[model samples]
Target chain A: VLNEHISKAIATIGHFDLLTINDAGMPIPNDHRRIDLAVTKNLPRFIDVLATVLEEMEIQKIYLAEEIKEHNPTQLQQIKQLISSEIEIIFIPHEEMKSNLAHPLNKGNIRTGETTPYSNIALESNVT
Target chain B: VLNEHISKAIATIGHFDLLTINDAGMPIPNDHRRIDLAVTKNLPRFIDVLATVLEEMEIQKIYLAEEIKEHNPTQLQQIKQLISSEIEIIFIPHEEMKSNLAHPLNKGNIRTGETTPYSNIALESNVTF
Candidate 1:
């Protein structure tokens, strides 16, 4: 069975909702609903969790940190491969992404076990 | 006068409530209340903001990332000097600290303009005596 929190989060978030898959170092807000999938070193990698979420959700746009391209090229390539050309891929400064995450637009933050630097992606849900 | 959100958050949170001061790269949850004090690089550094909060809040315990010992020694020294000896300091793996931040016990997260690596601190509030 799918994790109830994960399933409910995907189903419950509204359009423009920001669902984030972030590395183990990314901080999740204390009051917000969070699904921690981290178990051990890459037990559930960023790509795998993102792939599963993509299968169930309709992401209209995706935001990635610009540093991911330079610092985490492997993750950047894999993320690009998984998210086809249809969904808009926008790269912003990682600090700005973190600023947006603090804003009210975020719906949930998913923490993956991966520890790669700049390995965070925010998916904006499309209207269902 | 203090920022309304910041003041209210510090005043309203319960003992054992977790309040955090984090760098620009630290992510804040959408639903949780956040007070962003970031202005520019080192404009409102982590230590400065943390010191301001310390002036008003009674922090019983402090949690820091182990990496700071290696990568951010200056910040480590400043933090130690600022906090009194009566309080407890605990260091854990950076990932474990991040994991704990996701739990409900966290009251609020304070975002700073600091861009330094491992520049995050979570304060556990002490009961007003």
Candidate 2:
């Protein structure tokens, strides 16, 4: 996958320490820099790879969907199982996400998704 | 935190299902392979982060908004959540976020918020993510 969606998300968390997730079918370009990663498993689901990254990266706190449980419940449990509940998974619905966008990039292209997302959910860096 | 955000999400769930999470005040770059990021975080925001992304990315069926819990309860619990959900977090709001973008070279910009997200999240692969 290339860079586009991720880039947008990246921009969100870039200044802040946020995270944004999506599915494989989401559609990233093959050439964009934001993505273009190695696919270890074909059809790699979020739980499959993301969990690995979190454990490896030690990520905590999250902006997520509470309704997902109605469909894919198992994946949710897995996340808690990963950090021993230390993580603060904040349920941020689509609306809230829009509200957050109000902070806008100077380009003001967020509505066009023209601004780079950098896609990860925003994470406030542990600025020392 | 540069290309780290969108790109990583791209890397995971290359095929099947998913969504990740995070906030602003994070980090990116002035440049890099992924996040030669910037700082709207002056500080930027999420609805600020997404809605814009949505209009721009035109993203539909989001993967988020539930608990954000007490600290940011109003943001989540107050906003009334989303009429939809994506990738199945399973209360996914938190305990979940691993499962789960792009087009292809000259094409595959799917993951990492790639796949062109088309940002609009409309008919699929419309613009940017």
Candidate 3:
């Protein structure tokens, strides 16, 4: 039930819906509680699947920490606007991000993001 | 040529005047810059060799970060006092120690202090210890 070329590659595997995301980005669900796979490589691209997950969650906020440059293309601009406008976007500094990761509880805590291994993204999951 | 207890422990093999240090207590030179071996385990017993290395370097300061509880059973007190009176003994917090280690340049830096893997000690090597 998985295919790179087919768009409707759907399957009910062990009572769970098996979905796919492409390369370049990953998911950090808006609602953190349904995290069966907290830190996992869902698809690959950021824009490729964020919209899909947003369509499926109780998303309340979107957090980003990247240095957005004007050189970003129109598609990326659209992607950025899509995320920013749909929810409240909060930004944190890189140092703060590193400090947060160093917290004992977050050490082995699995959460997802683009594994550029970048620390510029955070998400709020599961809220009304 | 590197035999465990052969004591003559000689070598032009690779040539690091790496004489030795003991277990438990290790030497952190009172001088910071002459750091030939920054964070490495010289020998093992600290006091066992701290005396020998002191005869060899420019030790000036000893920094400690552990909690000094009054275990006044005496010998421990002697070790504590021996350290306190010698040069300036500076103390830092465990959180601060963590912060210092996390500094980028110090990340891969190897400056050994008994790695009970503890972070309570920081020293100025090549000191007048």
Candidate 4:
């Protein structure tokens, strides 16, 4: 079940706000707000929760770790199938993705029960 | 060489601002400005970079993955030696740490070239208060 905090967090995110949907194993720093959805392995797959966020948020840019191409190609295909072609999909090294999450620009962090390697994403809110 | 952007980023972080120092394999999602210092494997180890950040940032709480106790206990001991007893060291599941990274409350992220299993820390800046 989705919570009000997450719903409002995404709905109210200003233009260019950053939201992250990452695997359950992903570490979240203390200062940022956290919405932990993982109850079990694959309880809520990475793509499934991300799809929900995408529906509510107007995402302009999507960031993915380059390793996803090789490690989780299935996730990549599903992601491609869901997102609009207009949104830019920029791929960078996985380690860089970890570093990116700690900056103050990040808006929200979502944790899913995904066990797959490199199942993480950061979505930038678009101006409506 | 340290970049001016990173230098300024650390210098300007407000009290209670959260900053992360992570290993080379950690995945950092976008939306956060990143300072990637990972040039090569162990080019700058995790503890080395963290020590530098500690020098500039007035950290109140330090969060480390619980796995560090089993996988990188040596680093934990060193961290204990560097920080004051007044500063808290809270350990949580590694997965939770990843989710914490994406929150706006975070101020900065520093990427080190360490290849270790769990070499990451999120430092919450402390005020003079």
Candidate 5:
């Protein structure tokens, strides 16, 4: 079943608002709305969730952990395929990427069941 | 100056939408909008922030950690004085209270510099009409 929460969260998004697609182990803040789609180990893959969200939300930019380039290049390439060349991709230290989640413009975190390390990504919304 | 982001967040509140006011040590989700008002340790106390936010947002209910009753009774009394008798207060285990922050209805977290333990709170907004 498609989660209504995911659609509802995206519906409220305005320009520059952030929505994170992260792995199961990501340390979500106590106050952030956690849209946990993880049913079990690898039930919903990271790429699948990212692709679904990408189809609905107009992403102007994205933030990814720099470690992913070296640690999970396969997953990184999969991401590149889903995103267009025009969309800006910003790479930052994993620590800094995590800290950016605290930005006031963040809307929600969508947790996928994927166990891959450094699989988190943040999407900045763009208006149609 | 009053932070525009804080007001802007409150302006978006709808019935049953949650807004958390928490201490500096609380782990805010990377995806949740964090309205960090902390300038330094204990610069803007928890009670002060709560009071200020309550003045503008119409809170129907509040969630507090049960640990506060035993660990910080003084702060509890202060909270009671600030909240009206009509408002509902729900007490849950500290861990459960933290988990509730992830509820889909949550809007954002207001981080205060309060150093007190179990000083976190979640306010559920209510429509004026």
Candidate 6:
């Protein structure tokens, strides 16, 4: 079963709500909702958490750190393979991705234990 | 104006949902909802945030760390003054307060920059009866 908090948070999603699945290192803002799932180094892999969230959230768009394409291409390819073709993917600079967490519609940050560089993404909910 | 994120989170509260106003030192769980407000040492006082939230949420009960009574009596008095008499106050061991964050009904953790020891609390929402 999905983690209870994540499941409940997903149930509350409305159109355009932003939910971030980030690496353990991402510095989440003090006032934003944070859902930390990091148990240890790579205990719950980034891709796995992304896939799990994808199963429930009707994602319209995804934002990733541009650095991931160059720094972690294997993980990038895995993400592309997992996401549906209908969803739009956008790449922004790492700094920009960090700043986007402050968006008004942000639901929460789901932190994973992945240690790879730039293993971060923000999923924007689609209207169901 | 209140922080937009906080305002929105408060708008989503349902009956019995737990929202924690915590100190900077609290070790929030990795998988739970955390709302960190710390900027610098004591920039936004714990009581300030609690009072701000109290303005918006219909808190039914409050859980304070038992250590607060002995370690931070002044802040404890400030809390009692700010809270409503109708709201039930319960004191638990500091460790229990920490473990309670993992509760399924927990809405989020609002981390303040306060440096005071044992400055943590969990506010439970009340139905608008």
TM-score of each: 0.49, 0.32, 0.26, 0.49, 0.50, 0.51
Poorest 10 consecutive residues by lDDT, candidate 1 chain A: A35-44
Classify candidate 1 by CAPRI docking class.
Answer: incorrect
Q: Give the least accurate 10-residue stretch of model 3 chain B, judged by summed lDDT.
A: B1-10
Give lDDT: candidate 4, residue A105.
70
Best-fitting candidate, measured by TM-score? 6
Q: What DockQ would candidate 3 receive versus the native complex? A: 0.01
Model 5 root-mean-square deviation? 15.6
- Tens-place lDDT per residue, model 3, B15-103, is 11222221223333323111111112321123423432334333345444444333222323433544536556555554554454333
User: Which residue pairs come into collision in candidate 6?
Assistant: A30-B36, A31-B36, A36-B30, A36-B31, A37-B30
Docking quality of model 6: it rates as incorrect
Q: What are the DockQ scores of the candidates, in order?
A: 0.02, 0.02, 0.01, 0.02, 0.02, 0.02
lDDT (C-alpha) at residue A25 in model 3: 35
Q: How well is each residue in B1-129 modelled by candidate 4, as lDDT tens digits?
A: 133335667767787778888887887765545655543456456776676667776778999999999999888888888889999999999998898778577776766667878889898888834
RMSD of each: 13.3, 19.6, 21.7, 14.7, 15.6, 13.6
TM-score of 1: 0.49
**lDDT at position B49, candidate 2:** 32
lDDT of 1 by residue, B19-81 (tens): 888887777665556655443345356887787778888889999999999999999999999
The Cα error of candidate 5 at residue B84, in Å, is: 0.6
Worst 10 residues of 1 chain B by lDDT: B35-44
Each candidate's lDDT (Cα)? 0.76, 0.32, 0.32, 0.75, 0.79, 0.79
Estimate, for each residue in B1-129, the C-alpha lDDT of model 6 and write its tens digit.
134446666777889888898877888876537665553456346887787778888889999988999999998999999998999999999999999888888888777667899999999999844
Model 5: colliding residue pairs = A29-B28, A29-B29
Query: Residue A112 error for model 3, in Å?
Result: 7.8
When 1 and 3 are scored with DockQ, the better candidate is 1
Superposed model 1: Cα runs more than 4 Å off: A1-128
